[PDB]
Structures are given as C-alpha cells and as structure tokens.
C-alpha cells in the first residue's frame, strides 16, 4: 500500500508513535517519506547482505527474520514479510523497539541525514489529527 502523507500520519498516531521516546509525529512521517516514499512494500538490499523492509525500512540484520541474513537476529520476533503489510501495526511495534535501543531515531540513517533538525512539523501540515 502507498499511504498518503496525512493517512500515514493518522495511522502512526493511532499506534502511539506521536512523541514516542520524545519524537514528534512529523519526525516519523519524515523518516517514512525518505525510507519508503510511504510504500509498505518497499524492500532494499544492504551492502552487508541484510535487507530493509517496509515503511520504516527495518533491517533483517537485527529486527526481523528473512532466512537469508547469516548471523542476524530477529529482535522484533517477526518474519520480515510482516513488515510489508498494508496494516502498519508490526512496523510500528518493531520501530518502538528500534528507537528505544539507545541511539533514538539516528538508527534510521535517512532520518539523521534528511529529517534531523529540519522543520519536521511541515510533514503533518494540513492533516486532521
Ligand atoms: Na534476521
């Protein structure tokens, strides 16, 4: 599913991402924009052979099982395919564990390089939340 910006903002808020670990909704929407362009079906192979899955491009190296990432963990205890669903519940639940891991949203290199310190509130502008 390719979410609308305000559609994804509402979904993330409903699943309690708005100000989760101190990160306002616009940070999460910004990260999803540059990670996935709001496409739940987005997959991207990393140089280390791991893969990134879904709206928040969650890595099989640590967080989900895809069966093809030697020496990896599955700390969200989910098949990586569950992160491609039109229902973002598994992506959000897993993202809450990632952002709690100690480096906050710096875990998302695209957030650090493209969202951090910017006017992230722009991403929820016009939305009825
Ligand atoms: Na894994």
Curated annotation (Swiss-Prot):
<feature type="active site">
    <location>
        <position position="35"/>
    </location>
</feature>
<feature type="disulfide bond">
    <location>
        <begin position="76"/>
        <end position="94"/>
    </location>
</feature>
<dbReference type="GO" id="GO:0005615">
    <property type="term" value="C:extracellular space"/>
</dbReference>
<dbReference type="GO" id="GO:0042742">
    <property type="term" value="P:defense response to bacterium"/>
</dbReference>
<dbReference type="Pfam" id="PF00062">
    <property type="entry name" value="Lys"/>
</dbReference>
<keyword id="KW-0378">Hydrolase</keyword>
<dbReference type="GO" id="GO:0016231">
    <property type="term" value="F:beta-N-acetylglucosaminidase activity"/>
</dbReference>
<feature type="disulfide bond">
    <location>
        <begin position="6"/>
        <end position="127"/>
    </location>
</feature>
<comment type="subunit">
    <text>Monomer.</text>
</comment>
<keyword id="KW-0732">Signal</keyword>
<feature type="disulfide bond">
    <location>
        <begin position="30"/>
        <end position="115"/>
    </location>
</feature>
<feature type="disulfide bond">
    <location>
        <begin position="64"/>
        <end position="80"/>
    </location>
</feature>
<dbReference type="InterPro" id="IPR019799">
    <property type="entry name" value="Glyco_hydro_22_CS"/>
</dbReference>
<protein>
    <recommendedName>
        <fullName>Lysozyme C</fullName>
        <ecNumber>3.2.1.17</ecNumber>
    </recommendedName>
</protein>
<comment type="similarity">
    <text>Belongs to the glycosyl hydrolase 22 family.</text>
</comment>
<keyword id="KW-0964">Secreted</keyword>
<feature type="active site">
    <location>
        <position position="52"/>
    </location>
</feature>
<dbReference type="GO" id="GO:0050829">
    <property type="term" value="P:defense response to Gram-negative bacterium"/>
</dbReference>
<dbReference type="GO" id="GO:0003796">
    <property type="term" value="F:lysozyme activity"/>
</dbReference>
<dbReference type="InterPro" id="IPR001916">
    <property type="entry name" value="Glyco_hydro_22"/>
</dbReference>
<comment type="function">
    <text>Lysozymes have primarily a bacteriolytic function; those in tissues and body fluids are associated with the monocyte-macrophage system and enhance the activity of immunoagents. Has bacteriolytic activity against M.luteus.</text>
</comment>
<dbReference type="GO" id="GO:0016998">
    <property type="term" value="P:cell wall macromolecule catabolic process"/>
</dbReference>
<dbReference type="GO" id="GO:0050830">
    <property type="term" value="P:defense response to Gram-positive bacterium"/>
</dbReference>
<keyword id="KW-0326">Glycosidase</keyword>
<dbReference type="InterPro" id="IPR000974">
    <property type="entry name" value="Glyco_hydro_22_lys"/>
</dbReference>
<keyword id="KW-0081">Bacteriolytic enzyme</keyword>
<dbReference type="GO" id="GO:0042802">
    <property type="term" value="F:identical protein binding"/>
</dbReference>
<feature type="domain" description="C-type lysozyme">
    <location>
        <begin position="1"/>
        <end position="129"/>
    </location>
</feature>
<dbReference type="GO" id="GO:0031640">
    <property type="term" value="P:killing of cells of another organism"/>
</dbReference>
<keyword id="KW-0020">Allergen</keyword>
<keyword id="KW-0929">Antimicrobial</keyword>
<dbReference type="GO" id="GO:0005783">
    <property type="term" value="C:endoplasmic reticulum"/>
</dbReference>
<keyword id="KW-1015">Disulfide bond</keyword>
<feature type="binding site">
    <location>
        <position position="101"/>
    </location>
    <ligand>
        <name>substrate</name>
    </ligand>
</feature>
<dbReference type="InterPro" id="IPR023346">
    <property type="entry name" value="Lysozyme-like_dom_sf"/>
</dbReference>
<dbReference type="GO" id="GO:0005737">
    <property type="term" value="C:cytoplasm"/>
</dbReference>
